[PDB]
């Protein structure tokens, strides 16, 4: 085993594999080429046949009427010794140019974006620049550890070719690992733009193809599966905060006591079912409530009816008894294919069967029995616990709502005073909670959450390039819009920042310690608000429902058609 | 041995001295008419007519009254009403001008593009379907009859830096494009969404409705890959259902989406494989913005390199290639050869260079 030994061995295998693959394919490709050539013949023929039907009168030249001694001319000199040809030169007149812009996708709320550890692209500026200072091109590459796609020694790589390189390198190696940990280092160092070694090992895992799938409950191979496996997919993938599965905003998963519920309420008596109920021989309500009172700690004379449980039904019971707790009236009604009676018997059968056996970004805390004390992430982060935290109802570190009568746009509101928009579950009194579709409302500290922005108009800037203009007139301190973009790590900002530093304009706006908003690749209209030191706006970052979100307000009353600017402090 | 042999029958030079970035034979001209071509460079477009033999007649030339403009590419089409030819030129100002060389006037202009147009293309089947690629990272498909923008092929899974080339396939069913981000991208236009967007674009009239035309903004391609090339990919062409594309790795690579077997129209966006069939090795084309071309019947493939040497390969050669190209130099051709253009009949081959020079090479009798 040698560090450079593995590389040379990876190199010569690769070099061999590429050759023996080429000769096998070289047979097949000849057939593919012949075949493809057959496709050409046809489709070219079709166009050519279309060309016959066109009569295009081409090639007309014009000298007359005679040159008035106003127009310039174009000459063309010849190495054939035919005299130099001369033509007056047609002026293609006036067209207003548009300001420069690069294409960008529109957003309503921001977008979390993963770091990229290699810049896939080296920016062409440099010919007119003539490589000065060529130092920039080195220092740009240093931020990426010197990793650019595609910087290697090795001349090519593909997936079908890659898996054979891992398999021919496992054959090569006594054995087995059975899949090595050492070799993923060697094949990354040969391929910087495909590494780190970690990333190649996970790429190999996706490529070689399914447990722990629980199959379809609505389907023909539905298994009888425990509660947590039937629901494994939903709990693991649902976002509590924004209410989507695999959201674009929040990367941390469930916590997992977020998807455990308070067991109460209520456990109340409700009979009859009715009427073919779980009744009424000793053991009906008694042994039901008993079995779970025997199961919590740390009858049934009639012979139990004979019905058969499919894989779906059995799972669906199990999942329901979790959330419905012995209410077999409810469960039976829900399962729909069994009756109150049969659910109870299956419970009984299942109780008797054996199991085989500086500001930071908010991210909720969840230490189940112990309090939000000086070891709590939130209080370490010097942030409140929010609704999404899994601590006490009455934790001392939870932001309470505002009780405000109305607007809550002054210091007397506790929300406004914390640089927070209201909470539509907490601020029940101002009307941050009130009627939704009616998206203008009494509380005027909820506008970011509601996306309730003024109408903005795009035209060229009365200073430079592009600028942005408000349609409808607005007063001092009033909400104009949210500054939206990508969300990225201070690292990935530092990489993109350096490149935008060379273009002498950046669209990065600093959100908190952990994150920056980058309206460059994707954003929204207010991004065209220019930088003016004496601006007609300002940019307040606020805290809204766990997300930190930028807010662009007026700094002054503004006339219709005015161009919006704000100072860039960072 | 090799095929096919040529001899330099002429050379000439424009008056500006700036580079000829683009050169295009008029393939729309009916047989038994003179073989025409156009060149773009400096702030101008020039039109030349070949004559038997050697003689290249200077027909027309046009200068943008904006001093700063600089045309990068041209492409021929026709007015299927009046049966005129129509040349399209685009350049650094991000503005597409349409010249009609029978009226000798710029009859149309489109000014939606953010930055320069590095290539223009016209739909083989539809003489109104212009496709502008750009340094602004989006391709734009226009209907030049209706003054409408059909489709903008850029956004999320669009290109990440400059789009340098694209080609319609032979039937006009899909665009394969490429650019600076190292990436080739495949964009179908036979899909219901596009074919509908195309139709409604014809039906669009601005005196009939207060609305604008609703240009489909396409954010996602039907395929993408970055595993072929290792720097900017500057020219890409459709050889039927295979892809010819060059980066500056001293070869044009013939590859296909997916595995050996996987059919092009059965490829799904998520497809992670490609396969290299062959490479057409050349030498000394290290700079970018070096295009190749092929003849109408796709029997010959021509790339002019940066030291004035033209490489011409045969595409009836089974297997690599490997061997062997028909290499043709001249002792006064030095500058970089931006782009080659065959005449329709493969008799003539034009090339244009950085030094404003134009090189006419004709074939065996």
């Amino acid at each position: 085993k040698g560090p450079v030994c593995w590389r040379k061995r990876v190199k010569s295998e690769y070099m061999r594999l590429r050759q023996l693959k080429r000769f096998r394919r070289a047979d097949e490709v000849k057939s593919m080429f012949s075949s493809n050539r057959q496709k050409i013949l046809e489709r070219t023929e079709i166009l050519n046949q279309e060309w016959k039907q066109r009569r295009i009168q081409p090639v007309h030249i014009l000298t007359s009427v005679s040159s008035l001694r106003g127009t310039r001319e174009c000459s063309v000199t010849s190495d054939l010794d035919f005299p130099t040809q001369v033509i007056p030169l047609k002026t293609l007149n006036a067209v207003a140019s548009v300001p420069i812009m690069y294409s960008w996708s529109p957003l309503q709320q921001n977008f979390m974006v993963e770091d990229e550890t290699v810049l896939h692209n080296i920016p062409y500026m440099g010919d007119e620049v003539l490589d000065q200072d060529g130092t920039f091109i080195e220092e740009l590459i240093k931020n990426y550890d010197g990793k650019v796609h595609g910087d290697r020694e090795c001349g090519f790589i593909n997936d079908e070719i890659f898996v054979e390189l891992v398999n021919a390198l496992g054959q090569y190696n006594e054995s087995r690992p059975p899949r090595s940990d050492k070799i993923f280092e060697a094949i990354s160092s040969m391929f910087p733009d495909k590494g780190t070694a970690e990333e190649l090992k996970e790429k190999y895992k996706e490529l070689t193809q399914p447990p722990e799938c629980t199959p379809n409950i609505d389907g023909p191979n539905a298994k009888s599966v425990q509660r947590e496996q039937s629901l494994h997919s939903f709990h693991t993938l649902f976002c509590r905060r924004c209410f989507k599965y695999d959201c674009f905003l929040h990367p941390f998963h469930a916590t997992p006591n977020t998807y455990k519920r308070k067991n109460t309420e209520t456990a109340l008596d409700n009979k009859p079912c009715g009427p073919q109920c779980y009744q009424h021989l000793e053991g009906a309500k008694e042994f039901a409530a008993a079995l779970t009172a025997e199961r919590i700690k740390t009858p049934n004379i009639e012979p139990p009816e004979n019905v058969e449980w499919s894989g779906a039904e059995a799972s669906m019971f199990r999942v329901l008894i979790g959330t419905y707790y012995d209410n077999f009236c409810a469960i039976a009604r829900l399962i729909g294919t069994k009756t109150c009676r049969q659910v109870y018997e299956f419970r009984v059968k299942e109780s008797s069967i054996i199991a085989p056996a500086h500001v930071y970004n908010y991210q909720p805390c969840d230490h189940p029995r112990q309090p939000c004390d000086s070891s709590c992430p939130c209080v370490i982060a010097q942030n409140f616990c929010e609704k999404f935290c899994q601590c006490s109802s009455e934790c001392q570190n939870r932001f309470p709502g505002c009780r405000c009568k109305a607007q809550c746009n002054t210091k007397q509101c506790p929300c406004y005073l914390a640089v927070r928009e209201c909470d539509p579950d907490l601020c029940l009194t101002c009307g941050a909670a009130d009627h939704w579709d009616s998206k203008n409302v009494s509380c005027k500290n909820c506008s970011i959450q509601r996306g309730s922005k003024k109408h903005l108009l795009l035209a060229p800037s009365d200073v430079a390039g592009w600028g942005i203009f408000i349609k409808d007139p607005v007063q001092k301190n009033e909400f104009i819009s949210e500054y939206c973009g990508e969300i990225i790590s201070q690292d990935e900002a530092d990489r993109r920042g350096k490149v935008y530093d060379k273009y002498m304009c950046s669209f990065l706006f600093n959100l908190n310690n952990d994150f920056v908003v980058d309206a460059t690749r994707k954003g929204n209209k207010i991004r065209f608000a220019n930088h003016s030191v004496n601006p007609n706006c300002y940019a307040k970052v606020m805290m809204v429902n766990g997300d930190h979100r930028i807010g662009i307000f007026a700094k002054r009353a503004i006339q219709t058609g005015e161009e919006l600017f704000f100072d860039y402090r960072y | 041995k090799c095929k096919y042999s040529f001899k330099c029958v002429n050379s000439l030079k424009e008056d500006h001295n700036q580079p000829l970035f683009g050169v295009q034979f008029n393939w729309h001209s009916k047989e038994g008419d003179p073989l025409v071509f156009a060149t773009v460079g400096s702030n101008r477009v020039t039109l030349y007519e070949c004559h038997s033999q050697g003689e290249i007649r200077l027909l027309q030339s046009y200068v943008d009254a904006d001093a700063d403009e600089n045309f990068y590419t041209c492409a021929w089409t026709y007015d299927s009403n009046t049966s005129h030819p129509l040349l399209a030129v685009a350049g650094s100002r991000g503005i597409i001008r349409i010249i009609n060389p029978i009226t000798m006037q710029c009859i149309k202009h489109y000014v939606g593009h953010g930055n320069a147009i590095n290539e223009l293309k016209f739909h083989p089947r539809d003489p109104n379907l212009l496709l502008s690629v750009s340094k602004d990272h989006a391709l734009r498909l226009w209907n030049i009859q209706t003054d409408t923008l059909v489709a903008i092929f850029g956004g999320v899974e669009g290109h990440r830096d400059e789009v340098l080339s694209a080609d319609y396939d032979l039937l006009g069913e899909k665009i394969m494009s490429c650019g600076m981000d190292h990436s080739l991208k495949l964009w179908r236009i036979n899909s219901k969404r596009m074919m509908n967007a195309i139709k409604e674009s014809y039906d669009y009239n601005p005196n009939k409705t207060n609305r604008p035309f609703i240009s489909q903004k396409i954010h996602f391609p039907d395929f993408s890959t970055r595993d072929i090339h290792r720097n900017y990919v500057d020219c890409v062409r459709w050889l039927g259902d295979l892809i010819l594309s060059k980066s500056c790795e001293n070869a044009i690579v013939c590859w296909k989406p997916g595995k050996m077997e996987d059919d092009i129209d059965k490829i799904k966006p998520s497809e992670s494989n490609v396969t290299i069939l062959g490479r057409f090795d050349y030498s000394q084309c290290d700079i970018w913005y070096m295009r190749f071309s092929m003849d109408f019947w796709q029997k010959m493939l021509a790339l002019g390199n940066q030291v004035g040497k033209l490489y011409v390969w045969d595409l009836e050669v089974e297997d690599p290639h490997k061997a062997k190209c028909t290499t043709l130099t001249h002792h006064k051709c030095g500058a970089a050869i931006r782009q080659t253009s065959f005449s329709r009949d493969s008799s003539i081959l034009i090339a244009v260079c950085d030094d404003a020079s134009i090189w006419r090479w004709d074939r065996l009798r």
Partner: peptide, 10 residues
Amino acid sequence: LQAQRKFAQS
């Protein structure tokens, strides 16, 4: 290893 120029070079 290196970055691409549109023009060579003299």
